[PDB]
Design an enzyme around this catalytic site. Structure first.
Site, PDB file in Angstrom:
ATOM      1  N   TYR A 141      -2.971  -9.995   4.885  1.00  0.00           N
ATOM      2  CA  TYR A 141      -2.887  -8.612   5.330  1.00  0.00           C
ATOM      3  C   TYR A 141      -4.293  -8.057   5.532  1.00  0.00           C
ATOM      4  O   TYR A 141      -5.079  -7.935   4.592  1.00  0.00           O
ATOM      5  CB  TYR A 141      -2.072  -7.831   4.291  1.00  0.00           C
ATOM      6  N   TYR A 159     -13.088  -3.438  -1.318  1.00  0.00           N
ATOM      7  CA  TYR A 159     -14.270  -2.910  -2.076  1.00  0.00           C
ATOM      8  C   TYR A 159     -15.373  -3.897  -2.336  1.00  0.00           C
ATOM      9  O   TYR A 159     -16.539  -3.552  -2.109  1.00  0.00           O
ATOM     10  CB  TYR A 159     -13.797  -2.251  -3.377  1.00  0.00           C
ATOM     11  N   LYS A 213      -0.245  -9.899   8.393  1.00  0.00           N
ATOM     12  CA  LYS A 213       0.047  -8.507   8.791  1.00  0.00           C
ATOM     13  C   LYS A 213      -1.246  -8.010   9.379  1.00  0.00           C
ATOM     14  O   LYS A 213      -2.253  -7.814   8.649  1.00  0.00           O
ATOM     15  CB  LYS A 213       0.508  -7.714   7.554  1.00  0.00           C
ATOM     16  N   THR A 273       0.847  -1.212   0.000  1.00  0.00           N
ATOM     17  CA  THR A 273       0.000   0.000   0.000  1.00  0.00           C
ATOM     18  C   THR A 273       0.876   1.253   0.000  1.00  0.00           C
ATOM     19  O   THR A 273       0.600   2.255  -0.701  1.00  0.00           O
ATOM     20  CB  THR A 273      -0.861   0.020   1.254  1.00  0.00           C
ATOM     21  N   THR A 274       1.883   1.245   0.840  1.00  0.00           N
ATOM     22  CA  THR A 274       2.778   2.416   0.949  1.00  0.00           C
ATOM     23  C   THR A 274       3.559   2.667  -0.333  1.00  0.00           C
ATOM     24  O   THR A 274       4.001   3.785  -0.580  1.00  0.00           O
ATOM     25  CB  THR A 274       3.738   2.181   2.137  1.00  0.00           C
ATOM     26  N   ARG A 322      -9.429   0.307   5.312  1.00  0.00           N
ATOM     27  CA  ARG A 322      -9.263   0.558   3.905  1.00  0.00           C
ATOM     28  C   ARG A 322     -10.042  -0.350   2.971  1.00  0.00           C
ATOM     29  O   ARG A 322     -10.384   0.047   1.857  1.00  0.00           O
ATOM     30  CB  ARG A 322      -7.789   0.375   3.507  1.00  0.00           C
ATOM     31  N   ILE A 339       5.691  -4.545   9.841  1.00  0.00           N
ATOM     32  CA  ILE A 339       5.703  -4.155   8.444  1.00  0.00           C
ATOM     33  C   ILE A 339       5.322  -2.719   8.522  1.00  0.00           C
ATOM     34  O   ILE A 339       4.141  -2.355   8.673  1.00  0.00           O
ATOM     35  CB  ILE A 339       4.766  -5.036   7.612  1.00  0.00           C
TER      36      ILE A 339
END
Lengths: 291, 291
Positions: free
Chosen positions: A133, A107, A161, A44-45, A138, A203
């Protein structure tokens, strides 16, 4: 088996958005020099959402090349289509990634059984270690501890994660698993605690700008030294908070730009950190001794 | 300008997940015959997430072909990358869609300004009517009424699908816009109320199984006949609830299969409706006179 400070590295970009390969190479080297234990490429980052499939592959390939086997590389390969997640995960395996990190489908809100089937299908399709994860805020879905414990029985599912920042819940998960798979924090604010409670690592977003400090926090926390973890984490605690003033990776990319390590590029719909947060971020960098 | 019952049509699939072209055709015809006013192709309910780009184009092309200009076709073209949203929206314009429906970027959580820039960039790149779509429970971001009102100023932004189900907030948006762009309900349970308060229609899941009934609910609500809107909506009210017993489109696809109109195909990570909900659904369908 990957333990310690695992940076969820940004994907440096030129002002026009193109991947900044030269800055990326220098960042990977810096992380290895500073003590980072592993790198998650295109998570994501790293703006997985706005990189093309080709760019996704190229970033993973370049990080593995520069790392030169010195630290393990984990490739972000999550998707909200099982078919796509298999394709991305196979690509990471062929590129020589040591593991893949797969966020829960976002989503489309699969059921718990759908999450189970999703990950089971990917694990049976690709022989590569997979790390689940969960980041409900989100994705719109929360992979329960019960589902995680079920998935830990699947061959190739080697960790999760946990970005909930819910420490009692993380400890419950660690205890329930009894070592069957690893638990990594996905919440810098509470990572030190989770590691003292048995997590295998963090992480991390903060590791992007304080890789040495975070390497130390994870080492003492993994060693179960409660006071050293507290003391060392307290020095960078305000960074864990300020790097989320706007959605990650907006702040951390601006921080790295104030440090002189990358240019301002960031892809829409993301935007450069809003002007009003730049002085406060610079102050937090100076307070922590980073600039 | 598009008003009334706008079905967010499912993408019928064969058991192996392949698109069921013949069943899709029959559904499009049935909707036209039954009074549906417009179709959204490849929206959330149409499993946009798990269709390939080719399939996304084929489904839009096929619904446009079968509808033969009898009702307007809105193409779902949302993406969490602005570049990809532009491409998908251009493709829809080229295929002859009447408008495009674009859900806010999901998962990457852009700022309000980022959402503004995202939609401004698409509106400036493609000369096609665009309908925003806010469903924060799925995307991890909430496009505020303030941002929606800003975007209504942009040429080519002609409406917003408000799936909050928050009627006071929906009314506030309608009143603030004062006609500058359309408001559509994206929540079947409250759509009749929002249309009585000024919404131009309902981009509906329930219309998939009760197209005739929802077309009548929309027409009387838009005409501001409160008593008839309440009366007609009552006849299908329990369907609005049961179609979400698991994440949409899981229940609606199973309902259509109980109706004999599509097969059981649905793509992972989504799953066929869990067995525990099938009798309650079959009972609700029998209660409503659908089967």
């Amino acid at each position: 088996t990957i333990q310690g400070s695992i940076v969820a590295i940004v994907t440096p970009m030129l002002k026009d958005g193109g991947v900044d390969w030269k800055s990326l190479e220098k960042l990977v080297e810096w992380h290895i020099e500073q003590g980072t234990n592993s790198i998650v490429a295109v998570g994501t980052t790293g703006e997985a959402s706005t990189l093309s499939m080709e760019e996704h592959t190229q970033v993973i390939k370049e990080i593995i090349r520069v790392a030169n086997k010195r630290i393990p590389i984990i490739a972000g390969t999550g998707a909200n289509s099982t078919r796509e997640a298999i394709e991305l995960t196979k690509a990471a395996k062929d590129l020589g990634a040591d593991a893949a990190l797969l966020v829960t489908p976002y989503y489309n809100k699969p059921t718990q059984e759908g999450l189970y089937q999703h990950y089971k299908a990917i694990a049976e399709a690709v022989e590569l270690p997979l790390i689940l994860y969960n980041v409900p805020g989100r994705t719109g879905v929360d992979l329960s501890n019960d589902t995680a414990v079920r998935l830990a029985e699947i061959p190739n599912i080697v960790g999760i994660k946990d970005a909930t920042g819910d420490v009692p819940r993380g400890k419950a998960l660690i205890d329930a698993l009894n070592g069957k798979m690893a638990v990594y924090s996905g919440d810098d604010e509470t990572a030190w605690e989770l590691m003292l409670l048995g997590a295998d690592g963090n992480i991390s977003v903060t590791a992007n700008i304080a890789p040495k400090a975070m390497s130390e926090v994870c080492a003492v926390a993994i060693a179960k030294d409660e006071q050293q973890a507290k003391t060392l984490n307290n020095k960078i605690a305000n960074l864990h908070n300020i790097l989320f003033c706007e959605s990650n990776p907006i702040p951390v990319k601006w921080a790295l730009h104030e440090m002189g390590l990358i240019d301002t590029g960031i892809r829409l719909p993301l935007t450069p950190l809003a002007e009003q947060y730049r002085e406060p971020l610079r102050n937090a960098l100076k307070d922590a001794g980073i600039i």
